[PDB]
Write a protein that binds this ligand. Structure first.
Ligand SMILES: *O[C@H]1[C@@H](O)[C@H](n2ccc(=O)[nH]c2=O)O[C@@H]1COP(=O)(O)O
Ligand SMILES: [Mg+2]
Ligand SMILES: [Mg+2]
Ligand SMILES: [Mg+2]
Ligand SMILES: [Mg+2]
Ligand SMILES: [Mg+2]
Ligand SMILES: [Mg+2]
Ligand SMILES: [Mg+2]
Ligand SMILES: [Mg+2]
Ligand SMILES: [Mg+2]
Ligand SMILES: [Mg+2]
Ligand SMILES: [Mg+2]
Lengths: 252, 1635
RNA sequence: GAGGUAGUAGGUUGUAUAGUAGUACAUACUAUACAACCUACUACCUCUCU
């Protein structure tokens, strides 16, 4: 059935001849889809006539010839609209292949986008482009505060270092100054796997007294403060301040 | 705006007071100071331009820098004034004496130099704008100016000494000597302060909130705050003098104030912010010592937060705020609990107090469900720049804009702001206003307090212990602090701040003391409502007592209901300009008013009031008089409202109603079907055939008419398409032609041309000099012949189609005509006998004997038709004869391979043994099977020739015989038609179809020539039917220089306020006792909380019982009668103007001409070619269609409707004339007019396919099969009856109309035909002919002068219908010459019109057209808010006309181009050429900004930025801030065209001659290239990537951001005033960046 | 001659995004992307003609 139904009518009537009378009898000049209605005749003086209808003239003649032989026996933009809604570029389609016979070359149009690729095969390029675009269509329609948490993290980090010394600091009264705070801070820094670094400043203030800033690796890193008439009194004061700092961080 | 009128914008208020007298404008912002400065220079320059006087702007920022100051741009660009700002050591080049520069900006010592040299005279100067004088240095510099130039000149010679000093409240120094400094300043410069600005016009006119300066308590230091201050003061000592070896103080010092003022809980939540701001900013330390400082601060705040959390989270949220915070937040919580709609506006000092207050009220509003309605949003200030760190700046801008958009509409009420919320940001009117801080000065206090204007208004100021150092020392932790660690003066400051508060009330008393206008207090309006509300209300409809009235109070509420509902843009505040007045009558002070509704409004007179005893009863009564005259003049309807938009009813009789035909009317009313006037609904119309071609069959004996169908070949077909290479036969040389027999004389028709296999051939019809007397038996002869020609030859007969010789439709004869051998043409009777001799003769298959016998005849196959009789017997295909082939033979070489020679081929194919072997061959071809020869086969519609055949295929088909058609002669039968008669017979159907179409078009011409005298009746021949064929950096300067007057001003108005110049204690003591006694000072334990004749005599003291009578109230007409009697009996009523001289005089004292008109008398009307083209739809697939013609018809229709709507309805503003036009020009209306006037049955909508689109002559379709779905039965039954007799004898198979007799046509296409015929009548018979045709449809756009008939009128004045039952005609007169809009409500209106239009001669020398009625020019220039124009109206009525005039002018220019633009090209060389941007740029380029009068600030700033950015550009056409466009200047560009149109006695040569010189280089530039437009251009270049988001509102309150996005290409942004401007600039910047 | 493709070029109708002049949301002339369907020409093919 590679030949036209109009040519099928011509071949099945070439046994005697007969020029057929093809007239379009009727037309729906419709609002969105005008349709055509051809009417096929056969001789005008003795003793056949059929209807045919379709959207195009060629398909109308096809339906008319098919009816006479049996008696003898608008999308496309909508998928682009949806890819606009899903915020995509306009699709690009390319031609893949044909058949070496130029009267029966089934064109294949290759529609590739940034997401998927599909093929469209047809006897003409318009039906191939529809088939590729529709395959795109249902393929795309098948698949259309915290710093306080850091502070509490540091709190459970220092609670994880559960040495006796910190709860000893928490429980008893710490008015006593006779304890040597240097070994205390060394043991506490070893307890939470941290380290203490003293920076006694060679620069002096306006009272002539000595001072120091002492650094411990917190999360994020921190320092404490101290001063005294001597540098030894300065590091003792900063040591005591850091010890009571660790005591009150563990105090909860 | 009920009881107080609407206040003006404060800039024109200072402008009015400064025009009245000398002043010192005490206004803060520099830009509006520049606005008022520019304005008074302009108006008192208009006053100065009489004898020649200058007006200086002596200034202190001049004479040092070579650059020009900010007033140079203002007064050089946006005015017509020429300035000479003195350069640093100006040498005065050449003889350039200063009497020619209108403004003459100097320096003060320079002005002393000009005064002592007697070059600038101190008397011949009309204004002295000394710059800022709220500082010491400037006042000392200006001290020798006025200690030396007061005494010699009198105060008559002293000009206005306008001085743009700073804001009077935050200026100078001190508080006690403030009034003394102001009095000495006013006496120094010979002035009087008129400080009535936005600082004042928020507490005077608007709602006045009663403030409450509430005391909380002394914040007693509990042990928690004691330990917190102990550790913070421990850390203060180190960071005071910190150390470093080879920013932290501010966050360790200004956190303690949160502890002092708010408490420990807010200390935790405000060390939150500092902890984030330092932890984020400690990791970027380039040193190591500052890293340790920031670590110490951060871990101190960590310990602080931990201790505060352990305080009130482990030991135990309204109770926590109650117990563990300052009592100041308890006072705030009680204040917000006192409000059970609220728009609260809490303020602060810094930018971290706002955040902690936000978290305070968020947790209060959420944890405590009592105050559930508090939605909390905070907004801080901005300090950064786009120079560095754009990430933080953008994430702060996109948060601040969301916060202010949330507060903007209604979503979140409270807004805990900072100093950015005072100037700038536009916010809704508020309910509560809290100042958490005591105010810094009066600037913050009033710019914060002047925000709650609804009057349930409360403005609370929280007062507290003051600001001092709360530290102890440098010591370490105390014993109490360590115990807590191990275990766990209102009177002085409030006296000082109530002294500051009494000082603030004294400040506002001073400001109100310096005001010009004075207002009665609220006690007077209260006793007005109580006492005298017993007047007879003006009821328009008094019978139904729930309707309409104007009482005392409704009057003052209604005059500001009406004036605010007027046409006005964003820049204009339209208002009623009231005026108070006092006098003395009968010992009682009586008060007038005078009112002035806007000049935009049609109440163009002043409502001179009646003297009442108070001011506010006079106010209510003068508004009552205004509402009475308003309703009498027609502005008010039956419910005393202004008449709306759609409420305009046209008084002309042809207008209104517009009731439809019921087929159209029910589908308009129900609208379930597609609407009329649209292409979406189709309707099927009968294909009306010509009246000359129906019932014109000739009868035996009566003389009929013989029309030769003449053809003449013009352009033979070029041989590039001659692929078969056949000879070209002209049909002129053929002897056998064709004719038409018809009894009615065919009118003259245009000689159309067709395009056949021989090329272009021109078709005419001609009449014989003798007539045809038809004989008896020829009737059946031509009846047989016509059936033969149109049935067996051209195969045109369908089966629903049969020969009916006595028919109603398509009933003319066609005869075969022959040229006489001696010359001339006549009917071929012998050929008719030959044709009738053989009927439907099947071409017989002959035996061998005769072709054996006779030889070939060369003469028999000259012009032969040679069908093969050995196949296709019933309906053979007919072949031509192109050539004879003697060089071939039946034994010659076969083209193919499968057969031998032609004798062998015919022997073995059929059996036809060719007995004649010496016979030639016949080079033949088919005959035409597509009968439509109307289109050229080798041309496009655009003239582009189509590709002809390749030379290889041409020579293959012509030379190689595998192609081609070669046929033996003795095996073919000659048709009785020759080849020449066959080509004419094939070209007949298109000839008859075009003759029919021309006859319908001539029928329309005759119909309108009979209905209205538009054309000749019966007729020379027509014109033939055819088918037609460095800098960018400078731009940054012009984007920042304007903001220069912004930038410095902001800092200049928030910190300095400094520099003094060189009884009060009693007043402060009185105010302090009033504040402490009157409940304003809230103590810290007190929570926040007559008979008719007597009334008549006290109300009308200036007889009374005669006017009262026995009825109850008194009449307003009686009231004016008592006034008239009293002024008649008592001479004069000399009035004292209580606190306007601003306006006065009412309350005071032939290269394509476009209008070319042919003589319509004795005129043939349009040709039927152009009427056919107007009828020809674009679906015809013909070379003519209506589409290019509807674009000029539509533009002329819109033009003429607009001009008529201007002329008839002369008081109404054009916002309803637009509604009348939109009623009249809409395609529903033009549809129903067309279908009324039977046009749908006259059009072509289908491609002419003669086998399926044509009913041949003397044939008759039954018109029954198309609804139903023997031959003699079909004959006599289609004669008698249709349905009953027939019924006794791939979707919608019962489809509509057969194509032979009806066609489907959509509705908008008949509107298009109406407009196309307006275009055809326009082009042929002038604009007046199109006007009369527009009347003929039913849109009567002309006036009627019904005059008695001229006694068989004969001359026939065109545009005058056929007479009715009596002899009277309805002659349509021309358009009326309009009413000049010179409102003669002033006694010298021509002199005041010339006075207010001084200096426009530069404009008229620019344009070339000198106006004759210059009031048109002023009306075209006058903005809606140019309030001193008591002479004309605003321009909107003239813009409404000018844009339609320019629309038609552009369309008829682009229609006249030889380039022959499409509907699209001629549309888009208009759409991208009549635009607000191009109109504004041609306005700016030709100086329309320089001559546009307005009194609006925002429009002046927009005009500033645009004119500067254009004057940089040579006047050529992070969020991308592109320049806002002055739409007012585009409207001026249109309104000058409208004004020239009306001023020119309504012509279009003058408008186009003026506007060509402007728009012409855009005409050739945009005509050469392709213009487009930026939103459309970006949606065209990237067709469907581009999506536009919903617009967002910026934090500024008057900015819109659009955010264009191109997908996978970039996301872009632009900001602007409207949404159109912001969309345009964002798409424009994406257009420029995407390249 | 019928038919099947491919190229270009005139269109009509529909849908979607919109542009310009309006008016203060209808009104007019429209564009582009995309589609059907129509018509003029060209190049090559299967059949017929020859
Ligand atoms: O078969 C068509 C065509 O080949 C033939 N024809 C023959 C010779 C010539 O010079 N030109 C030409 O077109 O005529 C047949 C019908 O042609 P239309 O397309 O109907 O004009
Ligand atoms: Mg053909
Ligand atoms: Mg129109
Ligand atoms: Mg139209
Ligand atoms: Mg062919
Ligand atoms: Mg194309
Ligand atoms: Mg095209
Ligand atoms: Mg074409
Ligand atoms: Mg618009
Ligand atoms: Mg339209
Ligand atoms: Mg369109
Ligand atoms: Mg398109």
């Amino acid at each position: 059935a590679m030949k036209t139904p109009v040519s099928i009518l011509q071949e099945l009537l070439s046994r005697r001849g007969i020029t057929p009378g093809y007239e379009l009898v009727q037309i729906e000049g419709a609002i969105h889809e005008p349709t055509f209605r051809f009417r096929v005749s056969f001789k005008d003086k003795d003793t056949f006539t059929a209807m045919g209808a379709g959207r195009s003239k060629k398909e109308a003649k096809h339906a008319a010839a098919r009816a006479l032989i049996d008696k003898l026996i608008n999308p496309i933009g909508w998928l682009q609209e949806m890819c606009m809604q899903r915020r995509w570029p306009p699709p690009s389609y390319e031609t893949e292949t044909e058949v070496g016979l130029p009267h029966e070359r089934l064109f294949t149009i290759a529609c590739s986008i940034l997401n998927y690729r599909e093929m469209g095969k047809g006897k003409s390029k318009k039906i191939a482009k529809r088939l590729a675009a529709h395959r795109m269509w249902m393929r795309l329609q098948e698949t259309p505060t915290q710093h306080s948490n850091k502070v509490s993290q540091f709190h459970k980090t220092l609670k994880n270092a559960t040495g006796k010394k910190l709860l000893k600091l928490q429980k008893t009264c710490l008015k006593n100054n006779k304890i040597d705070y240097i070994k205390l801070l060394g043991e506490i820094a070893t307890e939470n796997q941290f380290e203490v670094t003293y920076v006694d400043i060679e620069e002096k203030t306006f009272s002539g007294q000595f001072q120091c800033l002492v650094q411990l690796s917190t999360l994020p890193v921190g320092v404490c403060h101290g001063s005294g008439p001597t540098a030894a009194d300065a590091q003792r004061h900063a040591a005591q301040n850091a010890l009571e700092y660790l005591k009150i961080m563990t105090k909860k | 705006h009920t009881t107080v009128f609407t206040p003006r914008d404060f800039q024109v208020e200072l402008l009015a007071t400064a025009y009245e007298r000398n002043t010192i404008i005490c206004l803060g912002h520099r830009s509006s100071k520049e606005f008022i400065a520019l304005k008074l220079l302009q108006e008192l320059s208009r006053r100065a331009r009489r004898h020649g006087r200058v007006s200086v702007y002596l200034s202190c920022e001049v004479g040092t820098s070579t650059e020009p100051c900010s007033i140079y741009t203002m007064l050089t660009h946006l005015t017509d004034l020429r300035v000479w700002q003195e350069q640093p050591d100006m040498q005065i080049p050449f003889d350039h004496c200063w009497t020619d520069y209108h403004v003459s900006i100097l320096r003060p010592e320079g002005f002393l130099y000009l005064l002592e040299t007697r070059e600038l005279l101190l008397s011949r100067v009309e204004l002295i704008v000394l710059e800022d004088c709220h500082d010491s240095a400037v006042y000392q510099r200006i001290r020798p100016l006025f200690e030396n130039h007061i005494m010699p000149a009198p105060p008559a010679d002293r000009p206005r000494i306008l001085g743009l000093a700073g804001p009077l409240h935050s200026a100078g120094c001190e508080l006690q000597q403030l009034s003394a400094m102001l009095a000495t300043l006013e006496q120094s410069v010979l002035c009087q302060i008129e400080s009535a600005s936005d600082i004042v016009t928020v507490l005077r006119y608007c709602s006045r909130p009663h403030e409450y300066i509430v005391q909380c308590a002394p914040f007693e230091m509990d042990e928690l705050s004691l330990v917190l201050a102990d550790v913070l003061n421990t850390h203060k000592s180190f960071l005071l003098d910190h150390r470093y070896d080879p920013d932290p103080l501010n966050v360790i010092n200004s956190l303690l104030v949160v502890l002092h003022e708010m408490g420990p809980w807010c200390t935790q939540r405000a060390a939150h912010h500092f902890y984030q701001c330092n932890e984020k900013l400690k990791v970027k330390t380039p040193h190591e010592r500052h890293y340790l400082l920031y670590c110490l601060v951060s871990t101190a705040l960590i310990q602080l937060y931990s201790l505060c959390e352990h305080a009130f989270h482990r030991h135990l949220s309204r109770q926590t705020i109650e117990r563990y915070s300052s009592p100041k937040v308890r006072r705030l919580l009680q204040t917000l609990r006192c409000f059970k709609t609220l728009c609260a506006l809490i303020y602060c000092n810094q930018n971290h107090t706002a955040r902690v207050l936000f978290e305070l009220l968020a947790e209060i509003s959420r944890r405590d469900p009592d105050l559930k309605f508090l939605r909390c949003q905070y907004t801080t200030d901005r300090v950064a720049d786009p120079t560095t760190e754009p990430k933080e700046a953008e994430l702060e801008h996109r948060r601040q804009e969301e916060v202010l958009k949330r507060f903007r509409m209604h979503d979140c009420n409270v807004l805990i702001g900072t100093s950015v919320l005072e100037e700038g940001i536009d916010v809704p009117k508020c309910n509560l206003v809290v100042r958490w801080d005591p105010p810094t000065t009066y600037r913050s206090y009033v710019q914060c307090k002047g925000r709650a204007r609804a009057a349930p208004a409360y403005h609370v100021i929280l007062v507290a212990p003051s600001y001092k150092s709360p530290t102890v020392g440098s010591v370490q932790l105390t014993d109490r602090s360590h115990r807590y660690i191990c275990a766990t003066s209102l009177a002085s400051t409030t006296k000082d701040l109530v002294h500051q508060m009494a000082q603030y009330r004294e400040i506002e008393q001073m400001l109100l003391s310096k005001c010009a206008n004075t207002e009665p207090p609220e006690q007077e309006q209260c006793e007005a409502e109580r006492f005298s509300a017993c007047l007879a209300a003006y009821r328009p409809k008094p019978h139904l007592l729930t309707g309409a009235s104007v009482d005392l109070g409704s009057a003052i509420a209604l005059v500001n209901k009406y004036c605010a509902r007027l046409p006005s843009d964003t820049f204009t505040k339209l208002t009623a300009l009231w005026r108070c007045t006092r006098n003395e009558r009968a010992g009682v002070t009586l008060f007038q008013y005078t009112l002035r509704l806007p000049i935009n409004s049609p109440l163009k007179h002043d409502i001179v009031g009646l003297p009442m005893p108070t001011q506010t009863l006079a106010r209510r009564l003068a508004a009552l008089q205004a509402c009475v005259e308003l309703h009498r003049i027609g502005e008010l309807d039956d419910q005393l409202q202004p008449i709306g938009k759609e409420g305009f009813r046209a008084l002309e009789p042809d207008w209104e109603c517009f009731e439809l035909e019921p087929e159209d009317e029910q589908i308009v009313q129900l609208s379930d079907e597609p609407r009329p006037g649209t292409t979406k609904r189709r309707q099927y119309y009968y294909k009306r055939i010509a009246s000359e071609f129906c019932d014109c069959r000739p009868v035996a004996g009566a003389p009929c008419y013989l029309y030769f169908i003449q053809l003449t070949l013009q352009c033979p077909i070029p041989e590039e398409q001659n692929t078969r290479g056949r000879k070209i036969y002209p049909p002129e040389d053929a002897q056998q032609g064709f004719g038409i027999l018809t009894t009615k004389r065919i009118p003259k028709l245009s000689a159309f041309s067709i395009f056949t296999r021989s090329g272009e051939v021109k078709v005419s019809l001609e009449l014989a000099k003798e007539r045809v007397i038809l004989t008896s038996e020829q009737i059946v002869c031509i009846n047989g012949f016509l059936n033969y020609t149109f049935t067996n030859v051209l195969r045109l007969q369908k089966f629903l189609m049969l020969f009916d010789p006595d028919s109603t439709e398509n009933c003319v004869f066609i005869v075969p005509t022959v040229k006489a051998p001696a010359g001339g043409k006549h009917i071929d009777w012998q050929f008719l006998e030959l044709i009738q001799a053989n009927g439907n003769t099947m071409p017989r298959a002959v035996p061998d004997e005769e072709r054996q016998a006779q030889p070939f005849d060369p003469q028999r196959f000259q012009d032969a038709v040679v069908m093969p009789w050995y196949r296709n017997q019933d309906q053979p295909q007919y072949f031509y004869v192109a050539e004879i082939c003697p060089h071939l033979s039946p034994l010659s070489c076969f083209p193919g391979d499968n057969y031998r020679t032609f004798k062998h081929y015919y022997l073995v194919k059929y059996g036809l043994t060719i007995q004649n072997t010496s016979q030639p061959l016949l080079d033949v071809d088919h005959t035409s099977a597509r009968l439509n020869f109307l289109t050229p086969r080798y041309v496009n519609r655009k003239g582009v020739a189509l590709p002809t055949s390749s030379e290889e295929t041409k020579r293959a088909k012509r030379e190689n015989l595998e192609q081609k058609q070669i046929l033996v002669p003795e095996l073919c039968t000659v048709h009785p038609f020759p080849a020449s008669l066959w080509r004419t017979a094939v070209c007949l159907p298109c000839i008859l179809y075009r003759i029919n179409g021309l006859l319908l078009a001539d029928d329309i011409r005759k119909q309108v020539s009979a209905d209205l005298g538009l054309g000749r009746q019966q007729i020379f021949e027509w014109p033939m039917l055819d088918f037609g064929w460095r800098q960018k950096q400078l731009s940054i300067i012009q984007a920042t220089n304007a903001n220069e007057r912004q930038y410095q001003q902001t800092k200049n108005l928030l910190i300095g306020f400094n520099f003094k110049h060189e009884r009060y204690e009693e007043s402060i003591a009185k105010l302090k006792t009033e504040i402490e006694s009157g409940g304003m000072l809230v103590p810290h334990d007190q929570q926040l909380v007559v008979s008719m004749m007597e009334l008549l005599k006290q109300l009308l003291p200036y007889v009374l019982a005669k006017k009262l009578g026995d009825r109850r109230e008194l009449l307003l007409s009686d009231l004016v009668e008592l006034n008239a009697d009293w002024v008649a009996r008592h001479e004069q009523e000399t009035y004292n103007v209580m606190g306007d001289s601003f306006d006065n005089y009412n309350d005071h004292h032939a290269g394509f001409s476009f209008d070319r008109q042919p003589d319509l008398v004795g005129h043939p009307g349009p040709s039927p070619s152009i009427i056919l083209q107007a009828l020809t739809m674009s679906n015809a697939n013909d070379g003519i269609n209506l589409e290019r013609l509807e674009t000029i018809g539509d533009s002329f229709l819109k033009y003429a409707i607009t001009t008529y709507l201007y002329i008839t309805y002369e008081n109404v503003h054009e916002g309803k004339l637009s509604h009348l036009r939109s009623k009249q020009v809409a395609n529903l209306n033009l549809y129903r007019l067309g279908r009324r006037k039977r046009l749908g049955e006259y059009m072509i909508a289908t491609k002419f396919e003669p086998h399926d689109n044509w009913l041949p002559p003397c044939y008759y379709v039954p018109k029954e099969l198309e609804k139903a779905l023997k031959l003699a039965d079909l004959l006599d039954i289609k004669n008698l009856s249709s349905v009953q007799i027939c019924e006794m004898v791939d979707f919608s198979c019962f489809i509509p109309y057969n194509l032979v007799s009806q066609h489907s046509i959509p509705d908008k296409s008949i509107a298009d035909c109406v407009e196309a015929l307006i275009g055809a009548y326009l082009i042929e018979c002038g604009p007046r002919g199109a006007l009369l045709f527009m009347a003929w449809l039913g849109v009567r756009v002309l006036p009627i002068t019904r005059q008695l008939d001229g006694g068989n009128q004969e001359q026939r004045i065109p545009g005058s219908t056929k007479p009715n039952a009596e002899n009277v005609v309805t002659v349509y007169g021309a358009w009326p010459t309009p009413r000049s809009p010179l409102l003669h409500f002033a006694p010298n209106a021509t002199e005041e019109l010339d006075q207010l239009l001084s200096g426009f001669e530069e404009f008229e020398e620019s344009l070339g057209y000198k106006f004759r009625d210059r009031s048109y020019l002023l009306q075209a220039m006058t903005h809606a808010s140019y309030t001193p124009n008591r002479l004309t109206d605003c321009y909107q009525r003239l813009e409404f006309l000018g844009d339609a005039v320019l629309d038609y002018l552009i369309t008829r220019h682009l229609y006249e181009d030889p380039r022959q633009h499409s509907p699209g090209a001629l549309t888009d060389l208009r759409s991208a050429l009549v635009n607000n941007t191009i109109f504004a740029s041609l306005a700016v380029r030709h100086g329309f900004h320089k001559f546009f009068r307005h009194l609006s600030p925002g429009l002046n700033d927009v005009i500033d930025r645009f004119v500067r950015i254009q004057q940089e550009n040579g006047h050529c056409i992070d969020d991308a801030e592109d320049v806002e466009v002055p739409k007012a200047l585009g409207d001026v560009f249109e309104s000058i065209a409208g004004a020239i149109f009306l001023d020119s006695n309504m012509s279009l040569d003058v408008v186009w001659h003026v506007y060509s010189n402007m728009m012409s280089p855009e005409i050739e530039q945009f005509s050469n290239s392709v213009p487009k437009s930026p939103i459309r251009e970006l949606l065209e270049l990237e067709p469907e990537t581009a999506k536009f988001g919903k617009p967002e509102k910026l934090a500024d309150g008057r900015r819109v951001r659009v955010t264009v996005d191109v997908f996978c290409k970039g996301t872009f942004r632009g900001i602007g005033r409207n949404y159109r401007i912001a969309k345009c600039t964002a798409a424009k910047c994406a257009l420029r960046q995407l390249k």
